[PDB]
Amino acid sequence: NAQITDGKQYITLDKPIAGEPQVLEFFSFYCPHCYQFEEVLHVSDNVRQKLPEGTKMTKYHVEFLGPLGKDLTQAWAVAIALGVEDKITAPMFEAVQKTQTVQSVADIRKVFVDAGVKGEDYDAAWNSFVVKSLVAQQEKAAADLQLQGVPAMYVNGKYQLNPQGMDTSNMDVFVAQYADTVKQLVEK
């Protein structure tokens, strides 16, 4: 059956925020731990797979890491606005961290284009009011929730996941524990 505990597998915010997405992840394409999180452990997908139906997995990008943090945050806004997150996430992590072929803003676009995204759509999205507000929203969320680092996950703007208090002696275990903790938090 299982049961989680405040202070252990999660922590409760002293200043919860209303109106946030139910399951909100922060990440950076630059961060090695975010790479492991997303591309090796596939934490988020495991979480999403245990999520009570009707509940969506939301991910925001952060600007405070790396030389292109701001522009990658805007590119992620485009990915959201175009609905191409699933086509882009793996290529970008590889291009940024592994092949290290993302050195400029133009190189970001190439990842989208190479991934199947029409350049005309990318360009339209990039300069849209829509994307401009998505950027603002990503920035605002991290501030409101008092983000200290990535990766990070918050549930109902009230609980923060705390992997340090999980069992990290085995990764298959840890992932299952992370997924279940989120599930329990959303049913709460």
Numbering used by the authors: 0 to 187
Paper text:
The disulfide form of DsbA is highly oxidizing and donates its disulfide bond to unfolded substrate proteins, leaving DsbA in the inactive reduced form. The inner membrane protein DsbB, in concert with its cofactor ubiquinone, interacts with reduced DsbA to oxidize the active site cysteines and convert DsbA to its functionally competent disulfide form.
The asymmetric unit contains six KpDsbA molecules each adopting the typical DsbA fold. Structural superposition of these six independent copies yielded a root mean square deviation (RMSD) < 0.45 Å for 176 Cα atoms between residues Gly6 - Val181. The cysteine residues (Cys30 and Cys33) are present in the reduced state in the crystal structure. The six independent copies of KpDsbA in the crystal structure allow an analysis of conformational variability of the loop residues forming the binding surface. The side chain variations do not influence the surface accessibility of the hydrophobic groove, which was calculated to be 371 ± 32 Å2 by CastP across the 6 molecules. Moreover, the hydrophobic nature of the groove is unaffected by the side chain conformational variability as indicated by the proportion of carbon atoms lining this groove (69 ± 3 %). The overall conformation of the NMR structure of oxidized KpDsbA is similar to that of the crystal structure of reduced KpDsbA. For example, superposition of molecule A in the crystal structure of reduced KpDsbA with the first structure in the NMR ensemble of oxidized KpDsbA, yields an RMSD of 1.09 Å over 169 Cα atoms. As expected, the redox properties, surface characteristics and binding properties of KpDsbA are similar to those of EcDsbA suggesting that inhibitors developed against EcDsbA are likely to also be effective against other members of this DsbA subclass.
